[PDB]
Design an enzyme around this catalytic site. Structure first.
Site, PDB file in Angstrom:
ATOM      1  N   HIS A   1       0.771  -1.240   0.000  1.00 17.35           N
ATOM      2  CA  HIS A   1       0.000   0.000   0.000  1.00 17.35           C
ATOM      3  C   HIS A   1       0.792   1.275   0.000  1.00 17.35           C
ATOM      4  CE1 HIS A   1      -3.948  -2.265   0.266  1.00 17.35           C
ATOM      5  NE2 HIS A   1      -3.331  -2.297  -0.903  1.00 17.35           N
TER       6      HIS A   1
ATOM      7  N   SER B   1       0.718  -0.899  -7.001  1.00 19.26           N
ATOM      8  CA  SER B   1       0.724  -1.849  -8.063  1.00 19.26           C
ATOM      9  C   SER B   1       1.449  -1.488  -9.339  1.00 19.26           C
ATOM     10  CB  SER B   1      -0.670  -2.395  -8.234  1.00 19.26           C
ATOM     11  OG  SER B   1      -1.371  -2.177  -6.986  1.00 19.26           O
TER      12      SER B   1
ATOM     13  N   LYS C   1     -14.109  -5.758 -11.272  1.00 14.59           N
ATOM     14  CA  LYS C   1     -13.129  -6.705 -11.795  1.00 14.59           C
ATOM     15  C   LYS C   1     -12.927  -7.866 -10.841  1.00 14.59           C
ATOM     16  CE  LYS C   1      -9.322  -6.014 -14.712  1.00 14.59           C
ATOM     17  NZ  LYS C   1      -7.944  -5.417 -14.582  1.00 14.59           N
ATOM     18  N   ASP C   2     -12.665  -7.523  -9.592  1.00 13.96           N
ATOM     19  CA  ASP C   2     -12.465  -8.522  -8.558  1.00 13.96           C
ATOM     20  C   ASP C   2     -13.668  -9.434  -8.387  1.00 13.96           C
ATOM     21  OD1 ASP C   2      -9.983  -7.658  -8.233  1.00 13.96           O
ATOM     22  OD2 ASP C   2     -10.118  -7.230  -6.082  1.00 13.96           O
TER      23      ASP C   2
ATOM     24  N   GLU D   1       1.360 -33.997  -3.834  1.00 18.66           N
ATOM     25  CA  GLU D   1       0.411 -33.599  -4.879  1.00 18.66           C
ATOM     26  C   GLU D   1       1.062 -32.589  -5.801  1.00 18.66           C
ATOM     27  OE1 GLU D   1      -3.193 -33.115  -2.739  1.00 18.66           O
ATOM     28  OE2 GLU D   1      -2.161 -32.556  -0.902  1.00 18.66           O
TER      29      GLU D   1
HETATM   30  C1  HEM Z   1      -0.927 -15.921   1.178  1.00 16.01           C
HETATM   31  C2  HEM Z   1      -0.850 -15.645  -0.115  1.00 16.01           C
HETATM   32  C3  HEM Z   1      -0.985 -14.240  -0.699  1.00 16.01           C
HETATM   33  C4  HEM Z   1      -1.949 -13.314  -0.587  1.00 16.01           C
HETATM   34  C5  HEM Z   1      -3.303 -13.425   0.143  1.00 16.01           C
HETATM   35  C6  HEM Z   1      -1.551 -12.180  -1.377  1.00 16.01           C
HETATM   36  C7  HEM Z   1      -2.217 -11.034  -1.615  1.00 16.01           C
HETATM   37  C8  HEM Z   1      -1.952  -9.970  -2.350  1.00 16.01           C
HETATM   38  C9  HEM Z   1      -2.850  -8.942  -2.854  1.00 16.01           C
HETATM   39  C10 HEM Z   1      -4.318  -8.920  -2.415  1.00 16.01           C
HETATM   40  C11 HEM Z   1      -2.147  -8.124  -3.638  1.00 16.01           C
HETATM   41  C12 HEM Z   1      -2.571  -6.888  -4.458  1.00 16.01           C
HETATM   42  C13 HEM Z   1      -3.030  -7.176  -5.895  1.00 16.01           C
HETATM   43  C14 HEM Z   1      -2.160  -7.786  -6.936  1.00 16.01           C
HETATM   44  O1  HEM Z   1      -1.131  -7.245  -7.378  1.00 16.01           O
HETATM   45  O2  HEM Z   1      -2.445  -8.914  -7.423  1.00 16.01           O
HETATM   46  C15 HEM Z   1      -0.784  -8.610  -3.707  1.00 16.01           C
HETATM   47  C16 HEM Z   1       0.254  -8.057  -4.432  1.00 16.01           C
HETATM   48  C17 HEM Z   1       1.544  -8.551  -4.495  1.00 16.01           C
HETATM   49  N1  HEM Z   1       1.927  -9.781  -4.017  1.00 16.01           N
HETATM   50 FE1  HEM Z   1       0.757 -11.089  -3.028  1.00 16.01          FE
HETATM   51  N2  HEM Z   1      -0.299 -12.406  -1.934  1.00 16.01           N
HETATM   52  C18 HEM Z   1       0.060 -13.674  -1.523  1.00 16.01           C
HETATM   53  C19 HEM Z   1       1.223 -14.284  -1.941  1.00 16.01           C
HETATM   54  C20 HEM Z   1       2.323 -13.727  -2.561  1.00 16.01           C
HETATM   55  C21 HEM Z   1       3.626 -14.401  -2.817  1.00 16.01           C
HETATM   56  C22 HEM Z   1       3.903 -15.852  -2.477  1.00 16.01           C
HETATM   57  C23 HEM Z   1       4.426 -13.399  -3.264  1.00 16.01           C
HETATM   58  C24 HEM Z   1       5.828 -13.473  -3.817  1.00 16.01           C
HETATM   59  C25 HEM Z   1       6.764 -14.263  -3.331  1.00 16.01           C
HETATM   60  C26 HEM Z   1       3.596 -12.216  -3.438  1.00 16.01           C
HETATM   61  C27 HEM Z   1       4.063 -11.016  -3.914  1.00 16.01           C
HETATM   62  C28 HEM Z   1       3.277  -9.949  -4.249  1.00 16.01           C
HETATM   63  C29 HEM Z   1       3.757  -8.777  -4.921  1.00 16.01           C
HETATM   64  C30 HEM Z   1       5.194  -8.511  -5.402  1.00 16.01           C
HETATM   65  C31 HEM Z   1       2.707  -7.935  -5.105  1.00 16.01           C
HETATM   66  C32 HEM Z   1       2.671  -6.541  -5.792  1.00 16.01           C
HETATM   67  C33 HEM Z   1       2.630  -6.448  -7.315  1.00 16.01           C
HETATM   68  C34 HEM Z   1       2.354  -5.179  -7.975  1.00 16.01           C
HETATM   69  O3  HEM Z   1       1.185  -4.782  -8.008  1.00 16.01           O
HETATM   70  O4  HEM Z   1       3.329  -4.559  -8.467  1.00 16.01           O
HETATM   71  N3  HEM Z   1       2.295 -12.403  -3.061  1.00 16.01           N
HETATM   72  N4  HEM Z   1      -0.703  -9.751  -2.926  1.00 16.01           N
HETATM   73  C1  HEM Z   2      -4.766 -22.274   2.778  1.00 15.71           C
HETATM   74  C2  HEM Z   2      -4.700 -22.757   4.066  1.00 15.71           C
HETATM   75  C3  HEM Z   2      -5.189 -24.239   4.058  1.00 15.71           C
HETATM   76  C4  HEM Z   2      -4.902 -25.071   3.093  1.00 15.71           C
HETATM   77  C5  HEM Z   2      -3.873 -25.007   1.941  1.00 15.71           C
HETATM   78  C6  HEM Z   2      -5.579 -26.326   3.422  1.00 15.71           C
HETATM   79  C7  HEM Z   2      -5.414 -27.527   2.749  1.00 15.71           C
HETATM   80  C8  HEM Z   2      -5.889 -28.739   3.197  1.00 15.71           C
HETATM   81  C9  HEM Z   2      -5.734 -29.986   2.487  1.00 15.71           C
HETATM   82  C10 HEM Z   2      -4.934 -30.076   1.190  1.00 15.71           C
HETATM   83  C11 HEM Z   2      -6.345 -30.938   3.178  1.00 15.71           C
HETATM   84  C12 HEM Z   2      -6.501 -32.430   2.862  1.00 15.71           C
HETATM   85  C13 HEM Z   2      -7.917 -32.844   2.428  1.00 15.71           C
HETATM   86  C14 HEM Z   2      -8.022 -34.124   1.640  1.00 15.71           C
HETATM   87  O1  HEM Z   2      -7.397 -34.171   0.547  1.00 15.71           O
HETATM   88  O2  HEM Z   2      -8.779 -34.975   2.192  1.00 15.71           O
HETATM   89  C15 HEM Z   2      -6.944 -30.305   4.347  1.00 15.71           C
HETATM   90  C16 HEM Z   2      -7.711 -30.924   5.323  1.00 15.71           C
HETATM   91  C17 HEM Z   2      -8.291 -30.365   6.436  1.00 15.71           C
HETATM   92  N1  HEM Z   2      -8.220 -29.015   6.696  1.00 15.71           N
HETATM   93 FE1  HEM Z   2      -7.476 -27.565   5.500  1.00 15.71          FE
HETATM   94  N2  HEM Z   2      -6.362 -26.148   4.540  1.00 15.71           N
HETATM   95  C18 HEM Z   2      -6.122 -24.866   4.955  1.00 15.71           C
HETATM   96  C19 HEM Z   2      -6.723 -24.237   6.040  1.00 15.71           C
HETATM   97  C20 HEM Z   2      -7.489 -24.917   6.979  1.00 15.71           C
HETATM   98  C21 HEM Z   2      -8.152 -24.282   8.099  1.00 15.71           C
HETATM   99  C22 HEM Z   2      -8.074 -22.794   8.375  1.00 15.71           C
HETATM  100  C23 HEM Z   2      -8.790 -25.224   8.809  1.00 15.71           C
HETATM  101  C24 HEM Z   2      -9.626 -25.067  10.086  1.00 15.71           C
HETATM  102  C25 HEM Z   2     -10.239 -23.912  10.385  1.00 15.71           C
HETATM  103  C26 HEM Z   2      -8.533 -26.479   8.128  1.00 15.71           C
HETATM  104  C27 HEM Z   2      -9.056 -27.672   8.541  1.00 15.71           C
HETATM  105  C28 HEM Z   2      -8.913 -28.869   7.885  1.00 15.71           C
HETATM  106  C29 HEM Z   2      -9.462 -30.135   8.348  1.00 15.71           C
HETATM  107  C30 HEM Z   2     -10.246 -30.376   9.646  1.00 15.71           C
HETATM  108  C31 HEM Z   2      -9.039 -31.057   7.471  1.00 15.71           C
HETATM  109  C32 HEM Z   2      -9.315 -32.552   7.565  1.00 15.71           C
HETATM  110  C33 HEM Z   2     -10.416 -33.282   6.868  1.00 15.71           C
HETATM  111  C34 HEM Z   2     -10.343 -33.328   5.365  1.00 15.71           C
HETATM  112  O3  HEM Z   2      -9.576 -34.127   4.758  1.00 15.71           O
HETATM  113  O4  HEM Z   2     -11.133 -32.488   4.865  1.00 15.71           O
HETATM  114  N3  HEM Z   2      -7.747 -26.270   7.013  1.00 15.71           N
HETATM  115  N4  HEM Z   2      -6.635 -28.957   4.351  1.00 15.71           N
END
Ligand code: HEM
Ligand code: HEM
Ligand code: HEC
Ligand code: FES
Lengths: 379, 98, 106, 81, 64, 241, 26
Positions: A201, A205, A227-228, A271
């Site tokens: 912020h 962007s 858009k979003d 996976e």
């Molecule tokens: C938990 C996962 C993530 C969330 C929720 C998230 C969220 C956001 C959002 C909402 C924006 C603003 C809009 C946009 O440019 O698309 C943003 C921008 C950005 N994100 Fe992420 N992001 C995540 C993961 C990452 C990762 C893994 C990286 C790089 C290693 C990354 C790097 C950036 C950068 C560089 C920008 C700014 C780009 C620009 O507008 O010039 N983000 N992120």
């Molecule tokens: C992005 C963050 C998270 C990711 C990437 C994620 C991903 C996953 C994946 C890949 C599995 C395996 C399911 C299957 O193939 O059977 C799983 C299972 C599960 N996750 Fe998530 N999860 C996330 C966040 C959460 C959160 C926030 C909760 C609780 C509030 C949660 C609760 C569970 C539970 C209880 C299971 C077990 C039962 C099942 O297989 O569905 N996870 N999660």
């Protein structure tokens, strides 16, 4: 001001980063992955909390528990298959995100880049433990072989793998740990996301052209809220298309088999979102060499800022890197393929040259190409 | 694994050197009739299959590694032979692995 | 000893220049620069004409990018017209700072 | 601080816009898309498609060999002899 | 009853005829040199495939 | 490292996005499992809940579930004095406990069919091509009696007795019990025990597709309504210069 | 869309056929 709702509450002002914020005009569709990124984080969570409203974290039951969520519980089936599939999306989205950053030099925002990276890796942990919760043949083994891959460290390793597991194998002790950390990571990650947003912020962007847009800025509310929402609409589409028509398709693993510790699917693999790093690991004979190189796969991200060689943060105007950028992506696809391959000659020899290609593309080719292009422009 | 006078000898006559790893059957057990192994092929360790292989030993379907009767690597891609957990025979019917 | 080689780079150069699409956008090479701390100061050093120009150019350019439209063939930036107008300004800014750095050794 | 009054400095530029209700949101979309879609794809194709093509060959060959070498159980060395 | 007829038909097509020749030589080669390590299984594995592709499509219209 | 043969995309009523399960098949199939298969393979997550899923009435399945508790009943579960009646009981475990099960079949352990379709790689195709695939061992091959040769088993050899053979059972209606005809019905009942939501989910698919075809176009127009000002926008630059 | 989605997520808590099976059956 008086009765300007927004800045009245101080709290509601903080929300005007959505509505009033300077957003560049020009802006590929690619940036919708930020927002969707959050979308996915929120969907997993709502989904998780309901599944964890009917899941149990024991050897005995866990398989049953999931099985029961998908059978007797009302709309538990979609919730669970929505949760599984989601995570796919979540990753599909993540890797668009980082692509964009790689390509247009959004990564110039070093501080934002470093949070991203943390983000990426945190989710990575999450996904690794959740998949093990259901305690099925793929999960069971996958945890062993990954975790054990930590025992490569010479002095500690061994002791340390045993602490993480809570014992000598992966019995109940480990299984409840993953349940707890899976649960609490996503909450911690949301804090990170917001911290990530905070930093971003402060400079807004970047664009396809690669130049500041300050001379062209637009209302985020008017334009970028639709858009979003539209982005969502397509995002959901993909998530339900998957979840409704081909629930298992993208979930390679067919191992709905309760884990038997003597039994083994000779074909053990993470996976799709982990295959790259798997492949890269196998290419090294030595264990330890493979763990280092696995970490470096992912951890190599934070270097790229320093690698940047050109004067145009935008790849948009530079051919040669646009060619090697694409190749890396297709090398990355190539590696993902290896991941589901028997570890035999054909695949070995291929993976090995792909793992060198990936590090060349990132470490050596691109950086040079940068220079070249700069010199052809006379820069 | 409770071996046999026919099995012991089997594994006894095998010429070390031509073994990926050089392991006298005698350096890998304490009491000849007995041989106890940690079912974790050294390669990527997904359990072997006793009575499979080519060297009359154990097979690990996972990638094509044959293990002899003393469980010694003879067809890779495994790196080493099979591990032998710690175990002391207490009473004549009792041996404690660990 | 560059007569054939360096009188042919212009050939790759020329190729390359039109390869990179910014040509088409109505933009020039100097406007494609990564806006960092030195560029920034150079930028600030520009006359009203030069400098307002760089604002319209980028305005017209980001407009095109937003609409995914290329400028007409007749209205494109020709390589033979390389206004390296930032270069002069940009050099010094660097020049000043290199000196500053150097003066700070001991 | 303040993001809208403080971005940059812009002199002498006019802009002209119209209201949503006065215009159409879908401007000869088929006609523009074809030619614009066509014109950018053809400027992308060359820079993008190659590496994918490459992967495909490598995929194809790479799977053939496998099936061969493994299905050609006699491949390594023949039967008769 | 159903399955057993369709199977035959399928192996009556020019590509089934053509690739059954490998099966025929296989079987004899192997049976006569019985000590060999040659697998007749592997040879059969090509026939079966082509028989079955066919079977499937037709076989289906005949069941309930 | 033996080539594994793979299952045809066998013509199924449900192969298609909108296609759904054929209950009569289910029904039939059920019996097949119950007579042909209940003997050594279990189905733990399946209750006696075919009712609406399998068109068996509540009275129908109650009765069907009553006799199964009268003969195999809760005496094998641990309900000393249990007999006919109950509907929460799950299909009766062939044997007390796994270890037994391997003894009855000599070392092998009859896989729970509940999920077989969704478990094992390759779905109901594999399951059908396994049962219906049984050919003559290949010149120069050896086979321990248990090790029957099957053209579709990984290791090229399975411990399976005549899975299904013509006229193994008889269905109420009169469906011609062919080896295959019965397999087509047995698989189908498996498909369903693997994924009981099969029909509902395809239903919703349908409703998510229509809806999404109304929201995707709509929402896009919104998006152009708003942006239009921008895209329609034209610019002019007039320096004093 | 919202209505079913929300409804499914609340019935997910309402009362599982597992439990409800035994309800009213004595
Ligand atoms: C938990 C996962 C993530 C969330 C929720 C998230 C969220 C956001 C959002 C909402 C924006 C603003 C809009 C946009 O440019 O698309 C943003 C921008 C950005 N994100 Fe992420 N992001 C995540 C993961 C990452 C990762 C893994 C990286 C790089 C290693 C990354 C790097 C950036 C950068 C560089 C920008 C700014 C780009 C620009 O507008 O010039 N983000 N992120
Ligand atoms: C992005 C963050 C998270 C990711 C990437 C994620 C991903 C996953 C994946 C890949 C599995 C395996 C399911 C299957 O193939 O059977 C799983 C299972 C599960 N996750 Fe998530 N999860 C996330 C966040 C959460 C959160 C926030 C909760 C609780 C509030 C949660 C609760 C569970 C539970 C209880 C299971 C077990 C039962 C099942 O297989 O569905 N996870 N999660
Ligand atoms: C006892 C007589 C059995 C009956 C009746 C059925 N099956 Fe079976 N099956 C049995 C054993 C002992 C085994 C183990 C095979 C091995 O070699 O370990 C099996 C195996 C299967 C499989 C194989 C899956 C695999 O392990 O890859 C399948 C698909 C299977 N059983 C399904 C199945 C069905 C659908 C049956 C009724 C129609 C059936 N089996 C009957 C023993 C017995
Ligand atoms: S894991 Fe046993 S040979 Fe590879």
């Amino acid at each position: 001001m008086t009765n300007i709702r927004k800045s009245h509450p101080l709290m509601k002002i903080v929300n005007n980063a959505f509505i009033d914020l300077p957003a560049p005009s020009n802006i590929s569709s690619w940036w919708n992955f930020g927002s969707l990124l959050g979308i996915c984080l929120i969907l997993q969570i709502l989904t998780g909390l309901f599944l964890a409203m009917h899941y149990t974290s024991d050897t005995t039951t866990a398989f049953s528990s999931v099985t029961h969520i998908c059978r007797d519980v009302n709309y538990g089936w979609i919730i669970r298959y929505m949760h599984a599939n989601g995570a796919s999306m979540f990753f599909i989205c993540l890797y668009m995100h980082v692509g964009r950053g790689l390509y247009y030099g959004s990564y110039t925002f070093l501080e934002t880049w470093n949070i991203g990276v943390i983000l990426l890796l945190t989710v990575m942990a999450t996904a690794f433990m959740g998949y093990v919760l259901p305690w099925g043949q793929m999960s069971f083994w996958g945890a062993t072989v990954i975790t054990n891959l930590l025992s490569a460290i010479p002095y500690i390793g061994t002791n340390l793998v045993e602490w993480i597991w809570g014992g000598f194998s992966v019995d109940k002790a480990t299984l409840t740990r993953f349940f707890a950390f899976h649960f609490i990571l996503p909450f911690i990650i949301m804090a990170i996301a917001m911290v990530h947003l905070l930093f971003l912020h402060e400079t807004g962007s970047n664009n396809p052209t690669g130049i500041s847009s300050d001379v062209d800025k637009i209302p985020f509310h008017p334009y970028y809220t639709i858009k979003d929402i539209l982005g969502a609409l397509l995002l959901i589409l993909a998530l339900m298309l998957l979840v409704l028509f081909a629930p298992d398709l993208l979930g390679d693993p067919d191992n709905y088999t309760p884990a038997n510790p003597l039994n083994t699917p000779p074909h053990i693999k993470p996976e799709w979102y982990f295959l790259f790093a798997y492949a890269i690991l196998r290419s090294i004979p030595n264990k330890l060499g493979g763990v280092l190189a696995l970490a470096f796969s992912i951890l190599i991200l934070a270097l790229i800022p320093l690698l940047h060689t050109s004067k145009q943060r935008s790849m948009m105007f530079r051919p040669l890197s646009q060619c090697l950028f694409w190749a890396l992506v297709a090398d990355l696809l190539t590696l993902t393929w290896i991941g589901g391959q028997p570890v035999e000659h054909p695949y070995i020899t291929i993976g090995q040259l792909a793992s060198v290609l990936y590090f060349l593309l990132i470490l050596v080719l691109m950086p040079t190409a940068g220079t070249i292009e700069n010199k052809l422009l006379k820069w | 694994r409770h071996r046999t006078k026919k099995e012991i000898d089997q594994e006894a006559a095998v010429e070390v050197s031509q073994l990926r790893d050089p392991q006298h059957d005698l350096e890998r057990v304490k009491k000849p009739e007995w041989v106890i192994l940690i079912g974790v092929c050294t390669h990527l360790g997904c359990v072997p299959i006793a009575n499979a292989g080519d060297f009359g030993g154990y097979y690990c379907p996972c990638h094509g590694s044959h293990y002899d009767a003393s469980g010694r690597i003879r067809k890779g891609p495994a790196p080493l032979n099979l591990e032998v957990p710690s175990y002391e025979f207490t009473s004549d019917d009792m041996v404690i692995v660990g | 000893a560059v007569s054939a080689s360096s009188r042919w780079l212009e050939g790759i150069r020329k190729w390359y220049y039109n390869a990179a699409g910014f040509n088409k956008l109505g933009l020039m090479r100097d406007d494609t620069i990564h806006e960092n701390d030195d560029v920034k100061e150079a930028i600030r050093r520009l006359p009203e004409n030069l400098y307002d120009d760089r604002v319209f150019r980028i305005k017209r350019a980001l407009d095109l990018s937003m609409r995914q439209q290329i400028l007409p063939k007749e209205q494109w930036t020709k390589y033979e017209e390389d206004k390296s107008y930032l270069e002069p300004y940009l050099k010094e800014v660097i020049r000043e700072r290199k000196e500053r750095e150097e003066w700070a050794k001991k | 601080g303040r993001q809208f009054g403080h971005l940059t400095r812009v002199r002498h530029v006019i802009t002209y816009s119209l209201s949503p209700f006065e215009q159409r949101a879908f401007p000869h979309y088929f006609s523009k898309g074809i030619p614009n879609v066509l014109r950018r794809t053809r400027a992308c194709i060359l820079r993008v498609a190659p590496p994918f093509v490459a992967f495909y060959l490598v995929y194809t060959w790479g799977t053939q060999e496998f099936e061969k070498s493994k299905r050609k159980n006699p491949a390594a060395y023949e039967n008769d002899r | 009853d159903p399955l057993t007829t369709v199977r035959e038909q399928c192996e009556q097509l020019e590509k089934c005829v053509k690739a059954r020749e490998r099966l025929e030589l296989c079987d004899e080669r192997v049976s006569s040199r019985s000590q060999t390590e040659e697998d007749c299984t592997e040879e059969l594995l090509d026939f079966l495939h082509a028989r079955d592709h066919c079977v499937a499509h037709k076989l289906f219209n005949s069941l309930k | 490292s033996d080539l594994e043969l793979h299952p045809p995309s066998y013509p199924w009523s449900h192969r298609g996005l909108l296609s759904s399960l054929d209950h009569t098949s289910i029904r039939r199939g059920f019996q097949v499992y119950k007579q042909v298969c209940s003997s050594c393979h279990s189905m733990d997550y399946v209750a006696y809940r075919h009712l609406v899923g399998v068109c068996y009435t509540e009275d129908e399945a109650k009765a069907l579930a009553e006799e199964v508790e009268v003969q195999d009943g809760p005496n094998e579960d641990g309900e000393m004095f249990m007999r006919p009646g109950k509907l929460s009981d799950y299909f009766p475990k062939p044997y007390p406990n796994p270890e037994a099960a391997r003894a009855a079949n000599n070392g092998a352990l009859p896989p729970d069919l509940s999920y077989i379709v969704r478990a094992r790689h390759g779905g109901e195709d594999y399951v059908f091509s396994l049962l219906t695939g049984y050919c003559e061992p290949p010149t120069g091959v050896s086979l321990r009696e248990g090790l029957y040769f099957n053209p579709y088993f990984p290791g090229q050899a399975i411990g399976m007795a005549p899975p299904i053979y013509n006229e193994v059972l008889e269905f109420d209606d009169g469906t011609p019990a062919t080896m295959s005809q019965v397999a087509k019905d047995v698989c189908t009942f498996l498909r369903w025990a693997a994924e009981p939501e099969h029909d509902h989910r395809k239903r919703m698919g349908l409703k998510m597709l229509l809806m999404m075809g109304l929201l995707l176009p709509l929402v896009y127009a919104m998006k152009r309504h708003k942006w239009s000002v921008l895209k329609s926008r034209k610019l002019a630059y007039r320096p004093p210069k | 869309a919202a209505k079913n989605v929300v409804s499914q997520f609340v019935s997910s808590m309402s009362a599982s056929a597992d439990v409800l099976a035994m309800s009213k059956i004595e």
